[PDB]
A paper describes a structure:
Our model protein for comparing methods of RT structure determination is the coelomic hemoglobin from the marine annelid Amphitrite ornata. DHP exhibits four activities common to heme proteins, peroxidase, peroxy­gen­ase, oxidase and oxygenase, with each activity employing an Fe(IV)-oxo (ferryl) intermediate. In this study, structures of a multifunctional globin, dehaloperoxidase B (DHP-B), obtained using several methods of room-temperature crystallographic structure determination are described and compared.
In this structure, the heme iron is pentacoordinate in both protomers, with no evidence of a distal water or dioxygen ligand. There is no electron density to indicate a hemichrome species in protomer A in this case. Notably, in both protomers the distal His55 residue is swung away from the heme iron and towards the protein surface [Fig. 2(c)]. Modelling of a dual conformation for this residue did not prove stable in refinement and so only the primary conformation was included in the final model. The observation of conformational change of His55 in the ‘swung-out’ position, in contrast to its ‘swung-in’ conformation in the damage-free structures (SFX and NX), implies another site-specific radiation-damage effect. SLX is particularly valuable where limited numbers of microcrystals are available, requiring far fewer crystals than are needed for either SSX or SFX.
Numbering used by the authors: 1 to 137
């Protein structure tokens, strides 16, 4: 289930983090605007960029902790506030996070693994609720 998926992803996180985030940037090209340094590069070129690997993994490092700390796929208000108040998230809307979890759930459904895809969809919807409650537009 959801808690087991956190262990599955964590066991190969750098791989999952890159593949999921690449699926996100490819499904939603306009999101590369928030990552100007990724425009005009293929997946393999991004996977060889140091900042891409490190940052994408750090994103998923924290995302798994937010998911780990959640109760019934509802994240703690503190994690939501942390995400909203980060300097690097100033200028991001709920739609940004909304699209990341669309790509995440679609990636899980297409992986053919036993991910609890419905729980991650809920987790993303609830995280968006918490992000809006914490002050994100």
């Amino acid at each position: 289930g959801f808690k087991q998926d956190i262990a599955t992803l964590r066991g190969d996180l750098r791989t999952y983090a890159q593949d999921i985030f690449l699926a996100f940037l490819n499904k939603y090209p306009d999101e590369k605007r928030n990552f100007k340094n990724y425009v005009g590069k293929s997946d393999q070129e991004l996977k060889s960029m140091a900042k891409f690997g490190d940052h994408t993994e750090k994103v998923f490092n924290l995302m798994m902790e937010v998911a780990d700390r959640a109760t019934d796929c509802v994240p703690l208000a503190s994690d939501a506030s942390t995400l909203v108040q980060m300097k690097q998230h100033s200028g991001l809307t709920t739609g940004n996070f909304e699209k990341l979890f669309v790509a995440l759930v679609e990636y899980m459904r297409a992986s053919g693994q036993s991910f609890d895809s419905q729980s991650w969809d809920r987790f993303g919807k609830n995280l968006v609720s918490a992000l809006s409650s914490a002050g994100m537009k």
